[PDB]
Design a protein around this ligand. Structure first.
Ligand SMILES: CC(C)=CCC/C(C)=C/CC/C(C)=C\CO[C@H](COP(=O)(O)O)C(=O)O
Ligand SMILES: CC(C)=CCC/C(C)=C/CC/C(C)=C\CO[C@H](COP(=O)(O)O)C(=O)O
Ligand SMILES: [Mg+2]
Lengths: 252, 253
């Protein structure tokens, strides 16, 4: 088991061509709808299916079978992305191909900056057999724009875009620490394309750059890809009855 | 559950104890009977802890379990282990130690030594040792000063550049934001500059412990580093000779 070392999922993300990635919120989207969606994501050629939410409860019982249902519907890697909780670390279920581990470098709480990683690894392997664990994608996670929800939960402070001083410190850490990926997120605004470009230029060639938050159109996906993103995530755009139309346009 | 990476009894002692010298015994060089003699004197001098440390080691567990037990039987001071990690194993550990000092080599060009050694170590926990019996972990930023091809070849470190404070300021932002417990400034072949010690003391939080070591052989040097803000001044080599009791009195006096 690679665990924190590069594995199959990271290799796939590094080698696949850049593009959109749909994020299914498993605590909002019924499993039957996730399964329908998963079949389309495969046809569209996305690199992976992310299951992610800021909120969760009864994680293991809900997610082990949710992950299994999704994997029965798509051959694409299923990657989990959820915040950690003191006393438990990051949530995990057997069957997931990988867990995205966000180190919230802009947080004022050292638990969310990185000690969550120590609690998670201490608890490993736990109830899940060693060879069956998901791979761990070590990720620098940064938040943009006003966001009191993530701020109250995780201690994050919006990254300053007044200059490159803060961002450059995060790039030095991303590189020296050997992180696998950088995830740029905005809950309420949009990550600036200029920031995406700055990150693509400052990161090593094998470091994967994800951007998400309020992406609702194919034009936005193209703009972020043109700015250097490897993957552009989107969740909310498909949380409605007419999601097939929306998905076609965002991917089109 | 064991405090592990959370602050525990050893960190509280290091935070609260009067600043001063700390003798470091290299257990792979110093015979255990001599370590026990030394431990008794360290206790009388009221040092904060006894560090057992070496750059080199082999057969760690069979050598160190009884060595640590002998030293613990000779002093009530906490016994702290400090050794480099090895890929595939992480940091070495034995039961009975009070704490392991975990160095994150922020100046290394190898990400394993920068911090992935911590992930390998915690993944392996609890391993062969019962959870309640594990040592506490002191999360430490470790930096090297001066030419040192030995640590460079072994761990990938590059000497910290003091031509500006840019590099150390980035390490201080990490030490603070990541909530490290301690910072360890080391020079294998030279001396950490007292002005760098002052820079770190001024930039760290009040609860972050600052250790300096490397070629400390006189009481004057200990005083200069304490005056500069070091919480602890480590010294090993000065006592690796027959006349160590005289050397110890001069360094601690
Ligand atoms: C803060 C952070 C990056 C990591 C900490 C862990 C954490 C809070 C993980 C949850 C996943 C996440 C970052 C945001 C939630 O929704 C968006 C899609 O947004 P849209 O509906 O606008 O398309 C997504 O999953 O990307
Ligand atoms: C490079 C680093 C700080 C950590 C990585 C792990 C590592 C190499 C740990 C071994 C302990 C160490 C840092 C130096 C060895 O001797 C000195 C004192 O020297 P003196 O004989 O000159 O008094 C000591 O133990 O401090
Ligand atoms: Mg473990």
């Amino acid at each position: 088991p690679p665990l924190w070392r590069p594995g199959r999922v990271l290799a796939r993300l590094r080698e696949h061509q850049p593009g959109p990635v749909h994020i299914i919120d498993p605590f909002k989207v019924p499993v039957t709808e996730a399964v329908e969606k998963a079949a389309e994501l495969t046809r569209l050629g996305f690199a992976a299916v992310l299951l992610a939410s800021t909120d969760y409860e009864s994680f293991e019982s809900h997610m082990e079978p949710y992950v299994a249902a999704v994997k029965a519907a798509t051959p694409l890697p299923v990657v989990l992305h959820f915040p950690p909780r003191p006393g438990a670390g990051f949530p995990v279920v057997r069957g997931a191909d990988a867990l995205l581990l966000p180190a919230l470098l802009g947080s004022g709480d050292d638990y969310f900056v990185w000690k969550s990683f120590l609690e998670t690894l201490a608890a490993f392997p736990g109830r899940i057999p060693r060879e069956e664990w998901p791979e761990l994608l070590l990720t620098v996670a940064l938040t943009f724009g006003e966001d009191p929800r993530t701020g109250d939960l995780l201690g994050t402070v919006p990254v300053s875009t007044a200059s490159t001083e803060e961002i450059d410190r995060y790039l030095h850490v991303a590189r020296a620490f050997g992180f696998h990926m950088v995830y740029l997120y905005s809950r309420n605004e949009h990550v600036p394309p200029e920031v995406v470009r700055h990150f693509r230029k400052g990161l090593g060639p094998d470091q994967v750059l994800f951007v998400s938050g309020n992406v609702r159109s194919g034009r936005q996906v193209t703009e972020y890809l043109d700015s250097g993103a490897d993957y552009v995530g989107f969740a909310g755009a498909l949380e409605q009855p007419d999601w097939r139309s929306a998905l076609a346009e965002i991917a089109g």
